[PDB]
Subunit: 184 residues, 11 copies
């Protein structure tokens, strides 16, 4: 099942080796923080892809244990919303890590959009912070000032392009159906 | 059962390969935001079909853990409604992903219709966001801005017209019944 | 038993093929919206029959996990009622889908009738929406605009007349009884 | 045991055949709805008898998961009561269907009689609507407008007179007790 | 035990035959309803005896899931009481049926006696309406208008005079005691 | 254990025969109801003795699932108390019957004595009414008007005398002690 | 364990015989009730001893399910306390009986002493009344008027003098210790 | 373990014999009750010692299921406190007895000391009353007025002086340690 | 594990002998009561050591089932705090004893220190009183007035000095780690 | 799986040796406390890496059992927020340690940011303090004054620069996918 | 697992011997209490190290059952905080001990820092007090006044200087990794 599989020696060794490696400059992006300066981070979908290639689509899971709206205030016609989220990630052997993430909206004149942005940022930040605990290869390096300083002294390479000639254009997946029919 | 089946090697390999692929332009649609620019997304029925072809009609499940109506306000005769939803998707081995979706209604003059639109859009958004977590093939690519600007530089293809000559026209399904009678 | 049977290869393959098919013009009905235009839908009993021929009378189940009366307002002597329902459909292997439905009553002058219409429409809409998630053959086509356009380009066929020469006219069922006596 | 028995092939085939048939004009009855025209339905005991012949006295069960009184109002000395009921039906393999029923009382000058009528009608309506979902043989025909039209073009047969010459006239059931004593 | 004993073929056949039969005129009694005309019914103890002889003293059981005092009102010095009861009957294989009964008290000048009558009549009505669902032989026939009309078309027999020449006159029961001693 | 012994054929047959027997005039006693006339009943300890001799001291059990004090009123210096109880009787195979009893106290001038009488009479009435459901031999006869009218047609026999020459005079009991010692 | 040992034939026969025996005049006492006359009863310790000799020190248990203080009132400087109790007795095969006892104090000028007397008398009365249900030998005789009037027709015997020449004088028990050492 | 060890024949016989014996004058002490006369009782530690020598140090347990502070009131500067306690004793086979004790403090000008006295005396009284129900050898004699009269007519013996020559003077226990080491 | 290890004969005999012994003068200490005289007691760490060497470090356990702060009052600038605790001790075979402890503070001008002293003293007193019930060797002697009299008539020994030349001076415990490594 | 493995002798010995080692100056950082002096600590990602390399990515888990916002105050236009967190770490054999952490914000003029900082710092501090309890190698040495004084008398080495020539630059990881495919 | 691993004989003997040893002066530390004198204690990390080396890093666990903020008062611009904690320690065979600890803060002008100090000190005090109960080697001797007097009669040795030439200076642990790879 899930939560009852135990990693083989080979898979455990491979994952433990892979999780020590640091993220290249391809995975890091920057933001200009309000009142602060350049803050580096890893986008959410990139962390999801890293988790999917590390553990497999069936090797990790995550849930929201609780999400609480901290405050919704109205000042000078603008909405200030702050929302909290607790996200828990589990592996296929039963290993788990749970963390908190926070979502903020300080702008918009519409309450619904503010709450939406806050809640979604909350769950995403919680997922990322909870995945950090498994190792460097999942975002535990963006907190190290050494790796951060060594990134900035590296050439600012252009963002890569995506090729769209072998993309998925039909719903049917012959190999998947053949395997599934043979698995029954 | 469900939740205690385990993927064989062939099926796991197949699904892992198939989930890395990116969606073609057939699946992407666009909107004009409320004060923003072109926002790209995937329709809900499209991601439901993609899930049914990836994991099978018996391979995945999803539930609404919680749904809270954040607010229903009345301003200048018009209703503003914001509703939250937590959706959890599960696979047949026990893997799961839970995310949050938000439904908003802005202009309508009827409280019932606004609440309806909110409650429904909430669950749809939650399902889509929870299915994103399995890989690009289920909507994790629509967030990659590189992928997006790679799509926008392709021609705007025509709307496809679907064949309705072999559509289902009777309730009875001889193959399904003949197969079921032999399972008892 | 239920929840712990697993589909054989033949039945799984048959159902997966049967669910991809689209519905013909016979299953679609139309409404004139309150300010909008032609909205296409599938009547509830039709979806129940489709589910009964897809999975069998014993292959699927459904429950109302929650039903909440959102509002009952009175304006100018007339009642406006809005009710929500959460419906969960489950297959005989443990595969489930849960969705929200909404029932509205706007004009009626009796409160009890309004609540009746609201609650019943809520349960039926929830059932239909939860059945959509199993495939096109259960009502996932009525969201595709391509399918709708291709439907509007077909002739407007006649409503068929049902035959009642072999209808049920006695309570006793000899075959069911002789089969059941041998099951003990 | 109930809930853990599984239908044999013969019994499943027989029941699935017997549930597709439509009800004759015998079972249908009419009402003049408040302000509305002829409404067709099936009396509750008829549906109970049909369920007992289809599945057996031990093949089906039903319970009330919830019953709440929506409102009890007083206007011009007359009472208006609305009651809701959730009824869940189950078979001997685990297959269940749960629906909602509503009872209304807008006449009588006595509160007790009004509440009584409302609650009893609620449970009966819930049972009927839950039994609809198994097939046409249990009342899923009443919604088809084609079947309702085709019924009215049949002759009007006067209700048959039931024979009371072999009715039960003593409590002892010799065959039943002989079988029971042999089953110990 | 109880709830885990499945009927053998002979007992099931016998009970299913015995439950279809209609009650004779010796079981039906009549009241003059308030405003309404003659209302026919079956006394409670008669239904209990019918159930004891259909299924055996150990083949059926019944519980009160909930009893709610709807209202107790005081008008012109007299008490008006209405009470609800939910009664659930279960057989020795797990088959169950749950129904609602209502107790009314209108005229009495003492609150305690009114509440007594209500609470007791509620449970009796619930038990009867629950046992109806097993078949005609337990009171599902008193609702058919055909059977009611055919009853009034029969001669009226004076109540039988019961024989007391072999009534129980000492507590000790030799047969039961010797069987019990041998059962240990 | 209890709730897990199944009656052997001999004991079942014996008890089923014994429960059909009506009670003699020795058991019935009479009261004069307030505002009414002669009401016949069976005293509580007699019903306890009948149950002990039918099923054995280890054959039945009973619990009080609920007891609610309906009201305690003070009028003209006197106390009017009404109390309800729910008693559940269970046999050694798992068969159970649950019923409601009601206790009243109208005249007394001390609150404690009134509540005491109410509670105790409530539990006793509930026990009797729950034991009725097992058959005639446990009090299902006192409701039949035929049996009651037939009882008055019998002579008024003298009150019996109780022999006290073999009464228990010391606590030690050799037979049960030797039997118990041989049981370990 | 306790609660799962089943009586052997010898012990069951012995106990069923021994419980039918009525109590001698040794066990009965007398009180002069306030507002009434001579009431007969059995002291609590006598019933505890009777239970210890009937079933053995390990053959019965009793618990207090609920105890409510019905009222504590103060009138002209004196305290009036009424307290309820629910006591449940259980044998070593799972057979149980539950009863309600009531304690009263209509006297004392101290609240603590009143509450103490009420609570203790409530538990004792509940235990006695719950032990009545096992048979005559445990107090089901004091309710029969025949047995009472047959007792008052007996000579009043002198108070017995207890022998204290072999009373327990040292704590250690050689036989019990030597028995326990051989069990381990 | 504890709660699942059934007594052997020898131990059961021995304990049953030992529990019938009455307690000598060594164990009884007297008090001058407030307003009342001489009241006899057994000190708590003596009852604990008796229970330890009867059932062994590992043969009995006791719990405090509830303890409610009934009242804490202040009059003329002095505190009156009444506290209740529900205590449950259990033997090593599963046999249990639960009773009520009450602690009273009607003197001291300090609230904490009065509450302490009340609570501790309450638990002690509950334990003594619960151990009474096992037999005379544990305090069921102090309620028999015959035994009390027989005690008061014995010579008032002197307080025994305890020998302290073999008292425990070092914590280590050679025999217990050797046995425990050999247990592993 | 714990609570599932029965004592062997040797260990049970050893502990039962050891628990009967009384404590010497080396364990008793004295206090001057608040308005009384010499009160004798045993310090907490002493009973902890006695329990450790009686039952072993892995042979007994204790929990605080409930701690309730009874009162915190401020009078004339000083704090009066009274706190209750319920302590439960359990041996390795499942035997347990639960008692109440009380902590008092009628002094200090600081609220935090008062509550601290109260809570800690409460838990310690509860532990000591709970350990009393296992026998004399754990503090069931400080309640016997005969033993207290016999203590004071024995010479007062001056406090012993503690050898501190083999005290623990490094964390490492070679024998413990050798055994722990061999235990894997 | 997790929570149910047991360390082999070799792994247990290795970890017990590794946990006693003290951390070098590489891991320690310093802060200037408000009004205080230099405080030494270990950053969060460092202790996460230490735990990942001690026990493995699958050998430890941590959860947030509770997080409560102690206070959110607004003084002179600035926000002061204090939040608590309870973090529980668990090893793969079932060993666990739970400890409290606290997050503080005393500055910022934005409420959402202050709550964010408080919550995140709280969870991190709790995780660190819970990991301390496993030994010095996880941050139990930063509390020793001797070790801290020995650190400051050691040369201050320049911050190590991180090399990025072998950093992870692609999502796919051939080794782990091959091992996982062989693990099915 | 953990909680079900019984100690072998050798390890039990070793730990029991080692837990009796009193701690040396190298472990004791001193404070100057407010209003009092020299108080002796053991720093928290010392007790954690002693527990790690007695039982192993996997031999003991601890949890916070409850933490309650007793009071947060503000007097003359300074904060007075008192908090409670219940800490439960458990060994690997199921043996547990639970004790209360208290945290005080009567200084600082900042509420956040006060609550922080209080809560952390409370958890640490609870852990120390709960570990005391296992023996002297974990801080029980710190309460014996004889040992405290004997400490001051011993030369005041200077605190040791810690060696940092074998400190951990890289995260990777070869021995642990080899063992873990061979344990899969």
């Amino acid at each position: 099942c899930f939560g009852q599989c135990q990693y083989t020696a080979e898979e455990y060794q491979a994952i433990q080796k892979a999780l020590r490696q640091r993220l290249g400059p391809e995975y890091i992006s920057s933001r200009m923080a309000g009142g602060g300066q350049k803050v580096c981070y890893i986008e959410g979908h990139r962390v999801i892809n890293l988790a999917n290639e590390m553990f497999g689509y069936n090797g990790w899971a995550h849930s929201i244990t609780q999400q609480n709206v901290d405050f919704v205030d109205l000042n000078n016609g603008k909405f200030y919303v702050g929302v909290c989220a607790f996200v828990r990630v589990q592996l296929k052997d039963g290993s788990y890590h749970e963390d908190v993430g926070y979502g903020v909206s300080e702008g918009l004149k519409s309450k619904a959009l503010s709450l939406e942005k806050a809640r979604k940022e909350a769950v995403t930040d919680g997922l990322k912070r909870a995945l950090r605990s498994f190792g460097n290869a999942l975002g535990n390096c963006i907190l190290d000032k050494d790796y951060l300083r060594s990134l900035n002294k590296l050439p600012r390479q252009l963002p890569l392009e995506v090729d769209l000639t072998k993309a998925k254009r039909q719903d049917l997946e012959p190999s998947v159906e053949e395997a599934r029919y043979n698995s029954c």
